Design a protein around this ligand. Structure first.
Ligand SMILES: NS(=O)(=O)c1nc2ccccc2s1
Ligand SMILES: NS(=O)(=O)c1nc2ccccc2s1
Ligand SMILES: [Zn+2]
Length: 259
């Protein structure tokens, strides 16, 4: 069974042994070289339609925590931008560091942010998520950088429930959470074709990475770092540095929605 992680013996540099696509042609994350990314006037504004989002549950899955949504019909969806069709929000999660100077998966001119939020959506033309991940245009992940400064008010409900899901396999009710409270002001973005950043590392993602980071407080991110990778009663391994480093860009272009 799966025994990959972010530890000293099963981290990203080992993943290729069980998931050979780890060395593939469209792996994520990547460094976004802002001077090489080209403005594409053909890109549209993103349409983030989360007014009818139905959050359900929050789960510590042993590598991050997922806030899960009802994706049994079109409620919270992502459209426009580089996308054709409609992508349904299934979950969001974060990647973060042991200290503020690392944690993001994507980097910007080699800068690492303290954390990165991933809002994961699947293309409804494929009927279910499991079918969508088998397709090159199956998923759209909206990535948002976190820097440490002022608190993010809309994040606080998330951080206050974390004490109740400290260890792997724990979950809690998490209804009526509004993910619009996690967005920055601007929806300017970069986009490129990539992959899932944890196993199975499938090359099924259109990445949309917002240029504007959100600000969270030191106290908020410190609470992320109190989570555990381990299960209940097991030796404590703090859930920190659950990020994959930048992968080779290979034959890919990163496009900018903005001049
Ligand atoms: N999936 S993996 O990163 O290749 C992996 N690494 C390790 C290390 C020790 C025991 C089992 C596994 S499975
Ligand atoms: N970190 S991510 O690319 O957004 C992502 N990776 C995976 C892997 C397995 C299942 C869901 C997701 S969502
Ligand atoms: Zn992620």
């Amino acid at each position: 069974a799966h025994h990959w992680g972010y530890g000293k013996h099963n981290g990203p540099e080992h993943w290729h042994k069980d998931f050979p696509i780890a060395k593939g042609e469209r792996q994520s994350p990547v460094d976004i070289d802002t001077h090489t990314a080209k403005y594409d006037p053909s890109l549209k504004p993103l349409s983030v339609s989360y007014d009818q989002a139905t959050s359900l549950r929050i789960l510590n899955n042993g590598h991050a925590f997922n806030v899960e949504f009802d994706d049994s019909q079109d409620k919270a969806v992502l459209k426009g931008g580089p996308l054709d069709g409609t992508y349904r929000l299934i979950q969001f999660h974060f990647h973060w560091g042991s200290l503020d100077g690392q944690g993001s998966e994507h980097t910007v001119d080699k800068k690492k942010y303290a954390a990165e939020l991933h809002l994961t959506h699947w293309n409804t033309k494929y009927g279910d998520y499991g079918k969508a991940v088998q397709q090159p245009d199956g998923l759209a992940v909206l990535g948002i950088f976190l820097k440490v400064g002022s608190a993010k008010p809309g994040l606080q409900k998330v951080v206050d429930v974390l004490d109740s899901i400290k260890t792997k396999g724990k979950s809690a009710d998490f209804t009526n959470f509004d993910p619009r409270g996690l967005l920055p002001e601007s929806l300017d973005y970069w986009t490129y074709p990539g992959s899932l950043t944890t196993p199975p590392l499938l090359e099924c993602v259109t990445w949309i990475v917002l240029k504007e980071p959100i600000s969270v407080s030191s106290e908020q991110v410190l609470k992320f770092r109190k989570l555990n990778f381990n299960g209940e009663g097991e030796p404590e391994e703090l859930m920190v540095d659950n990020w994959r480093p930048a992968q080779p860009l290979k034959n890919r272009q990163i496009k900018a929605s903005f001049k």
